[PDB]
RNA sequence: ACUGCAGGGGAGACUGGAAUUCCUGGUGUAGCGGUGGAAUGCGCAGAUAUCAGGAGGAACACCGGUGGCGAAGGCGGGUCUCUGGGCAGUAACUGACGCUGAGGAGCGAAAGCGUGGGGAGCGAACAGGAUUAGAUACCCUGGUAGUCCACGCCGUAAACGGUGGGUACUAGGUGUGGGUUUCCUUCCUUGGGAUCCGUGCCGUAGCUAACGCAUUAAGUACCCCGCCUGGGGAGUACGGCC
C-alpha cells in the first residue's frame, strides 16, 4: 500500500454533474483489490496553457489513492483507453 | 531492499542471542537473501551492469566470513552451510 | 480585388538574402516582394541598403490591396533586421507591434560541421 | 537568503501554480540560481516542480 | 525460438528449425478438422495454372473462425495453442462459455489460461475483437476485414500488424504490412494485437528437399531454356537473355494493378 | 545493525513540448539557395515565403554552475516499477575477520562486424561546381554506409590528473557540495565557532634538472602489484592464443 495522487484531465464536452459517476466505475477497479480512496477533489473548468488535441479548456481531477503498485499501473491503463481523458499523471506523494 | 521488519527474521532464525546482528552466522545469513533476492533482479534486466558489480562486492565480502568462520571453530561452518548452501 | 484593412508584415532575414512578405491576420500572402525581387545578385542581396528596398517594395504593393496597419514579426540572425522596420514607416504603414519569432530548438536536431574556412 | 530554508515547511506542489509565476521569466524560461536565491536542493525542487507543470498544461512552455 | 542444427551432415550446415516452445496438446480438435488434398497448380481444365507447386506432405484443414460475430459479450478462455500445416501462424482453441469449439490465429501473447472477450464493449488486450469505432487511434490491429460481415482479410501472416491512424466521419485510415496507406470502413472488425511466432522469417530451411516437403517445386531459368520455350532462351554460350526482362508469357516488367480499378477511391497512398 | 540525509549511479515500461524534414490542402508570384566572390542545384509543370492539419525519426532549450553521481568508461525532458553504492550521527553487535594481489575473471568512449528492425537530420565512400601550376583537399549543392533500436561479437583511445592501491604524520589563508552540533536562540542569521566526508584556488617547511607539487603531495615514512634500462629497426617478423 503506497501513496499516489492521480491527475487527470477530463475532455470539456463533459456536464460537471456526471463527472462523478463516470470515474467511479474506474475507481472500483482499486476497491475490488483491497486499496483505498481518499480524496476525489473536482477542480472544474479551468483554461489550459496549450492546446491538447484540438481542445482549449480541461477539467482537472485529483484523485488521491493509497493502493497496491499494481492497480495503479492498471488503473492509468484503463484512464488512457478512455475517449473522455486527455492527459494522466501518476505520482507519489511519500519519500 | 529487505526492510527493517524483514531482516529481524533472519536474525532471530540465525543469530546467536537476540540482539547479535553481527556475528559471522548473523552477517552471512543477510547477505545470503540479499544475493539470492539480486538475481531475480538480474533474470529480468540482464544488463544492468552497474547492479550486477554490487553482487559481486556481496559475494565476495561473504567468501571472506565463510573463510572466517572455517578458522576458529569449524563446528559452526559445517552447521552454517547445510541451513543455506553451498556449492 | 482582395481589400483588408489591417495586416501582419512577416520579415525573414539571414546572412544572404531578405524577404517581406505582408499578410492578412489569417495569414494570407498579400504582397511579398524580395532583396532579389528589387534588383540585386549575390553578396549585394545580404546588404542593409538591399533590405530597405524590399521593405519599400512590399510596402507600396500592399497599400494598393488597402493596408493600412500591420504588425511586424521579424526572425533570422540577419542584418536587415533593424533597417527592414525603419523602411516600412517611411511608406505610409503604421508598425503596431514589433515581435520575436526565430525559431529557438530545444537541443533537437543536429546542426552542421564547422566551417574550417 | 533563499525563501524556502527560511520559511520552514512550505511544500513545493507542481499543483501550486501560483507559487511558480514567479522563478520563471516573462518568455516562460526558469530562473537561474543566482537571481531568485535558492540553493542546490530547492533549485532543483523548483525545477521539477515546473517542469511537471508543463506537462499538465499548468504552465506553457514558451510564450511571449 | 528458433534453433540451429549442427553441421552433421552436408545438407544440415546452416539449418535451422523452429522451437516449437509455445505449442501444446500436439494433435488437433476432431470436430474441426476438414479433408484436404493438393491440387498440383492444376485447374479445372487440368493444366498447370500455376508453375513451381506440386508434391509435399499430406495436410488436413482446421477452420478456423475469421468471422466472430456471434459470440458478442460471450467470454472464451484459451485452451491450446497448436501447429497448423496451412499457415505460417499459430493458431489457438478457443473454449466458449457456452460450449462451442472455436480456432483464431493466435496473437504474440496469447498463452493458456487467458480470457478473450468480443463485441463492442470489450478491453483493449491481446486476443480480443472489436470494430474499429471501438478501438482507439494507434493501436496495432490484426485480422481486419474489407467489408462489414465479410470476415477477415488483412494482417494474418506471421509477425504482420496493421497501425490504425485515424477515424474521420465513417472511414478508418489503415497502414497496412506493405506501407500502403488505406481507407475501409469503421463498422470493419479487427483483433488487437501483432501475430505471433513471428519469428519464423529467419528460418533457414536446409537443404533441397526440404522445400519439396513443403509443396514447392524446382524453378528453371528462363536463359537456360530453348527460344521455343522462353524469351530468354537460347544462345551459344550463356547469355543475360537477348533483350529486357520478361515473363515466360511475353510480359514486360511493369505495374500489373489495374489502372481504373474500382477501389481507386478507397487507397490513400500506395507502397514505397 | 538502527535512525537520518544528498545525488544526471543503473535497468525496464509508458509518456511530453519546441525545432528540422516530408506529405496533403489554402493564399501568393519569380525567384530561392549559396560564398571571400561565384557556380553546380531547386524553381517557373507554381518553388522560397505565409497559414492550417497529418506522418516519422532523433536529440532533450531554460534549470546547468566554478556543481552533483559512479571503480573507470561514462550519466540529465517527465512518470511509475525494480536496484547498486556513498556520507553523518548513536556506539547496540562480531572480535583482526585487515591491505595488496603474479596468473585469472568481469566491466570497458568512438569506429567497426553478424542477424533483424528503423532511417527525420547529419554524413566517410561518391558525384558535380568553384579555387588552383595541379586539387584525389579546404569552401558549396547533393548524397550511400553508418549514427538510432533489439540480441551477440570487437576489447582498442592523448581510456589523462600523461600521477597504481591502503595507512600514519607534517603551518595556514580562502570558495563551494553533503551531514551533526555549541554561543548572543528567537539578537533569527539561516551569520559565527567546533568536528566528519567530498571538491577547487593561492600559499610555508620539505622535495624537484627545471617548470612546478605542496594536508586531494610529486613532502616524511612502511606493506604489496605493475613497469623501465640509448635512438631507429618495432609494438614489426616468426611461433602461439583469442
Ligand atoms: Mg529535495
Ligand atoms: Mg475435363
Ligand atoms: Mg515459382
Ligand atoms: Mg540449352
Ligand atoms: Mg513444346
Ligand atoms: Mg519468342
Ligand atoms: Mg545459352
Ligand atoms: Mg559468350
Ligand atoms: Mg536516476
Ligand atoms: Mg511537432
Ligand atoms: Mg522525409
Ligand atoms: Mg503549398
Ligand atoms: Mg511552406
Ligand atoms: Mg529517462
Ligand atoms: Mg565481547
Ligand atoms: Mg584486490
Ligand atoms: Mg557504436
Ligand atoms: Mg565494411
Ligand atoms: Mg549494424
Ligand atoms: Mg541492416
Ligand atoms: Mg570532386
Ligand atoms: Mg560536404
Ligand atoms: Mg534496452
Ligand atoms: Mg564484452
Ligand atoms: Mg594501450
Ligand atoms: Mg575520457
Ligand atoms: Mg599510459
Ligand atoms: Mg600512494
Ligand atoms: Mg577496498
Ligand atoms: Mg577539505
Ligand atoms: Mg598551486
Ligand atoms: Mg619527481
Ligand atoms: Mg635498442
Ligand atoms: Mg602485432
Ligand atoms: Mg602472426
Ligand atoms: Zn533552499
Given at each position: 500500500?503506497?501513496?499516489?495522487?492521480?491527475?487527470?484531465?477530463?475532455?470539456?464536452?463533459?456536464?460537471?454533474?456526471?463527472?462523478?459517476?463516470?470515474?467511479?466505475?474506474?475507481?472500483?477497479?482499486?476497491?475490488?483489490?483491497?486499496?483505498?480512496?481518499?480524496?476525489?477533489?473536482?477542480?472544474?473548468?479551468?483554461?489550459?496553457?496549450?492546446?491538447?488535441?484540438?481542445?482549449?479548456?480541461?477539467?482537472?481531477?485529483?484523485?488521491?489513492?493509497?493502493?497496491?503498485?499494481?492497480?495503479?499501473?492498471?488503473?492509468?491503463?484503463?484512464?488512457?483507453?478512455?475517449?473522455?481523458?486527455?492527459?494522466?499523471?501518476?505520482?507519489?506523494?511519500?519519500? | 531492499?529487505?526492510?527493517?521488519?524483514?531482516?529481524?527474521?533472519?536474525?532471530?532464525?540465525?543469530?546467536?542471542?537476540?540482539?547479535?546482528?553481527?556475528?559471522?552466522?548473523?552477517?552471512?545469513?543477510?547477505?545470503?537473501?540479499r544475493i539470492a533476492d539480486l538475481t531475480?533482479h538480474l533474470?529480468?534486466?540482464?544488463?544492468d551492469?552497474?547492479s550486477r558489480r554490487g553482487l559481486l562486492l556481496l559475494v565476495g565480502?561473504?567468501?571472506?566470513?565463510?573463510?572466517?568462520?572455517?578458522?576458529?571453530?569449524?563446528?559452526?561452518?559445517?552447521?552454517?552451510?547445510?541451513?543455506?548452501?553451498?556449492? | 480585388?482582395?481589400?483588408?484593412?489591417?495586416?501582419?508584415?512577416?520579415?525573414?532575414?539571414?546572412?544572404?538574402?531578405?524577404?517581406?512578405?505582408?499578410?492578412?491576420?489569417?495569414?494570407?500572402?498579400?504582397?511579398?516582394?524580395?532583396?532579389?525581387?528589387?534588383?540585386?545578385?549575390?553578396?549585394?542581396?545580404?546588404?542593409?541598403?538591399?533590405?530597405?528596398?524590399?521593405?519599400?517594395?512590399?510596402?507600396?504593393?500592399?497599400?494598393?490591396?488597402?493596408?493600412?496597419?500591420?504588425?511586424?514579426?521579424?526572425?533570422?540572425?540577419?542584418?536587415?533586421?533593424?533597417?527592414?522596420?525603419?523602411?516600412?514607416?517611411?511608406?505610409?504603414?503604421?508598425?503596431?507591434?514589433?515581435?520575436?519569432?526565430?525559431?529557438?530548438?530545444?537541443?533537437?536536431?543536429?546542426?552542421?560541421?564547422?566551417?574550417?574556412? | 537568503?533563499?525563501?524556502?530554508?527560511?520559511?520552514?515547511?512550505?511544500?513545493?506542489?507542481?499543483?501550486?501554480?501560483?507559487?511558480?509565476?514567479?522563478?520563471?521569466?516573462?518568455?516562460?524560461?526558469?530562473?537561474?540560481?543566482?537571481?531568485?536565491?535558492?540553493?542546490?536542493?530547492?533549485?532543483?525542487?523548483?525545477?521539477?516542480?515546473?517542469?511537471?507543470?508543463?506537462?499538465?498544461?499548468?504552465?506553457?512552455?514558451?510564450?511571449? | 525460438?528458433?534453433?540451429?542444427?549442427?553441421?552433421?551432415?552436408?545438407?544440415?550446415?546452416?539449418?535451422?528449425?523452429?522451437?516449437?516452445?509455445?505449442?501444446?496438446?500436439?494433435?488437433?480438435?476432431?470436430?474441426?478438422?476438414?479433408?484436404?488434398?493438393?491440387?498440383?497448380?492444376?485447374?479445372?481444365?487440368?493444366?498447370?495454372?500455376?508453375?513451381?507447386?506440386?508434391?509435399?506432405?499430406?495436410?488436413?484443414?482446421?477452420?478456423?473462425?475469421?468471422?466472430?460475430?456471434?459470440?458478442?459479450?460471450?467470454?472464451?478462455?484459451?485452451?491450446?495453442?497448436?501447429?497448423?500445416?496451412?499457415?505460417?501462424?499459430?493458431?489457438?482453441?478457443?473454449?466458449?462459455?457456452?460450449?462451442?469449439?472455436?480456432?483464431?490465429?493466435?496473437?504474440?501473447?496469447?498463452?493458456?489460461?487467458?480470457?478473450?472477450?468480443?463485441?463492442?464493449?470489450?478491453?483493449?488486450?491481446?486476443?480480443?475483437?472489436?470494430?474499429?469505432?471501438?478501438?482507439?487511434?494507434?493501436?496495432?490491429?490484426?485480422?481486419?476485414?474489407?467489408?462489414?460481415?465479410?470476415?477477415?482479410?488483412?494482417?494474418?501472416?506471421?509477425?504482420?500488424?496493421?497501425?490504425?491512424?485515424?477515424?474521420?466521419?465513417?472511414?478508418?485510415?489503415?497502414?497496412?504490412?506493405?506501407?500502403?496507406?488505406?481507407?475501409?470502413?469503421?463498422?470493419?472488425?479487427?483483433?488487437?494485437?501483432?501475430?505471433?511466432?513471428?519469428?519464423?522469417?529467419?528460418?533457414?530451411?536446409?537443404?533441397?528437399?526440404?522445400?519439396?516437403?513443403?509443396?514447392?517445386?524446382?524453378?528453371?531459368?528462363?536463359?537456360?531454356?530453348?527460344?521455343?520455350?522462353?524469351?530468354?532462351?537460347?544462345?551459344?554460350?550463356?547469355?543475360?537473355?537477348?533483350?529486357?526482362?520478361?515473363?515466360?508469357?511475353?510480359?514486360?516488367?511493369?505495374?500489373?494493378?489495374?489502372?481504373?480499378?474500382?477501389?481507386?477511391?478507397?487507397?490513400?497512398?500506395?507502397?514505397?
Amino acid at each position: 500500500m503506497r501513496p499516489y495522487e492521480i491527475m487527470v484531465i477530463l475532455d470539456p464536452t463533459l456536464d460537471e454533474r456526471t463527472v462523478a459517476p463516470s470515474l467511479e466505475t474506474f475507481l472500483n477497479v482499486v476497491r475490488k483489490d483491497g486499496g483505498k480512496v481518499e480524496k476525489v477533489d473536482i477542480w472544474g473548468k479551468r483554461r489550459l496553457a496549450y492546446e491538447i488535441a484540438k481542445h482549449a479548456e480541461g477539467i482537472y481531477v485529483v484523485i488521491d489513492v493509497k493502493a497496491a503498485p499494481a492497480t495503479v499501473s492498471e488503473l492509468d491503463r484503463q484512464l488512457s483507453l478512455n475517449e473522455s481523458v486527455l492527459r494522466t499523471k501518476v505520482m507519489r506523494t511519500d519519500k | 531492499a529487505l526492510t527493517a521488519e524483514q531482516k529481524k527474521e533472519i536474525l532471530r532464525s540465525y543469530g546467536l542471542h537476540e540482539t547479535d546482528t553481527g556475528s559471522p552466522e548473523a552477517q552471512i545469513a543477510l547477505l545470503t537473501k540479499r544475493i539470492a533476492d539480486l538475481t531475480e533482479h538480474l533474470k529480468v534486466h540482464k544488463h544492468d551492469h552497474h547492479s550486477r558489480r554490487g553482487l559481486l562486492l556481496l559475494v565476495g565480502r561473504r567468501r571472506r566470513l565463510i573463510k572466517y568462520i572455517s578458522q576458529i571453530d569449524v563446528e559452526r561452518y559445517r552447521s552454517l552451510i547445510e541451513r543455506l548452501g553451498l556449492r | 480585388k482582395k481589400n483588408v484593412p489591417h495586416g501582419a508584415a512577416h520579415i525573414k532575414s539571414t546572412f544572404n538574402n531578405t524577404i517581406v512578405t505582408i499578410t492578412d491576420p489569417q495569414g494570407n500572402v498579400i504582397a511579398w516582394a524580395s532583396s532579389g525581387h528589387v534588383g540585386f545578385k549575390g553578396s549585394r542581396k545580404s546588404t542593409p541598403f538591399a533590405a530597405q528596398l524590399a521593405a519599400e517594395n512590399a510596402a507600396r504593393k500592399a497599400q494598393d490591396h488597402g493596408v493600412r496597419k500591420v504588425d511586424v514579426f521579424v526572425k533570422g540572425p540577419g542584418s536587415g533586421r533593424e533597417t527592414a522596420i525603419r523602411s516600412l514607416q517611411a511608406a505610409g504603414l503604421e508598425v503596431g507591434a514589433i515581435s520575436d519569432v526565430t525559431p529557438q530548438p530545444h537541443n533537437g536536431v543536429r546542426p552542421p560541421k564547422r566551417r574550417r574556412v | 537568503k533563499c525563501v524556502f530554508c527560511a520559511k520552514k515547511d512550505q511544500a513545493i506542489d507542481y499543483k501550486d501554480t501560483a507559487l511558480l509565476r514567479t522563478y520563471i521569466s516573462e518568455r516562460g524560461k526558469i530562473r537561474a540560481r543566482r537571481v531568485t536565491g535558492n540553493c542546490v536542493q530547492h533549485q532543483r525542487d523548483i525545477a521539477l516542480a515546473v517542469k511537471n507543470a508543463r506537462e499538465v498544461a499548468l504552465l506553457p512552455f514558451t510564450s511571449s | 525460438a528458433i534453433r540451429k542444427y549442427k553441421p552433421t551432415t552436408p545438407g544440415r550446415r546452416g539449418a535451422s528449425v523452429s522451437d516449437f516452445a509455445e505449442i501444446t496438446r500436439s494433435t488437433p480438435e476432431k470436430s474441426l478438422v476438414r479433408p484436404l488434398h493438393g491440387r498440383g497448380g492444376r485447374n479445372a481444365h487440368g493444366r498447370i495454372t500455376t508453375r513451381h507447386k506440386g508434391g509435399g506432405h499430406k495436410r488436413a484443414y482446421r477452420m478456423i473462425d475469421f468471422r466472430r460475430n456471434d459470440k458478442d459479450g460471450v467470454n472464451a478462455k484459451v485452451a491450446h495453442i497448436e501447429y497448423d500445416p496451412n499457415r505460417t501462424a499459430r493458431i489457438a482453441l478457443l473454449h466458449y462459455l457456452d460450449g462451442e469449439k472455436r480456432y483464431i490465429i493466435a496473437p504474440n501473447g496469447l498463452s493458456q489460461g487467458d480470457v478473450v472477450e468480443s463485441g463492442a464493449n470489450a478491453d483493449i488486450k491481446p486476443g480480443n475483437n472489436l470494430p474499429l469505432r471501438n478501438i482507439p487511434a494507434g493501436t496495432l490491429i490484426h485480422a481486419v476485414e474489407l467489408r462489414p460481415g465479410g470476415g477477415a482479410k488483412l494482417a494474418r501472416s506471421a509477425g504482420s500488424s496493421i497501425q490504425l491512424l485515424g477515424k474521420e466521419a465513417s472511414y478508418a485510415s489503415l497502414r497496412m504490412p506493405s506501407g500502403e496507406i488505406r481507407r475501409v470502413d469503421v463498422r470493419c472488425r479487427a483483433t488487437v494485437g501483432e501475430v505471433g511466432n513471428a519469428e519464423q522469417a529467419n528460418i533457414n530451411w536446409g537443404k533441397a528437399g526440404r522445400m519439396r516437403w513443403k509443396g514447392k517445386r524446382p524453378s528453371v531459368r528462363g536463359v537456360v531454356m530453348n527460344p521455343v520455350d522462353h524469351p530468354h532462351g537460347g544462345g551459344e554460350g550463356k547469355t543475360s537473355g537477348g533483350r529486357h526482362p520478361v515473363s515466360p508469357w511475353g510480359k514486360p516488367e511493369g505495374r500489373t494493378r489495374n489502372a481504373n480499378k474500382s477501389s481507386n477511391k478507397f487507397i490513400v497512398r500506395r507502397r514505397r
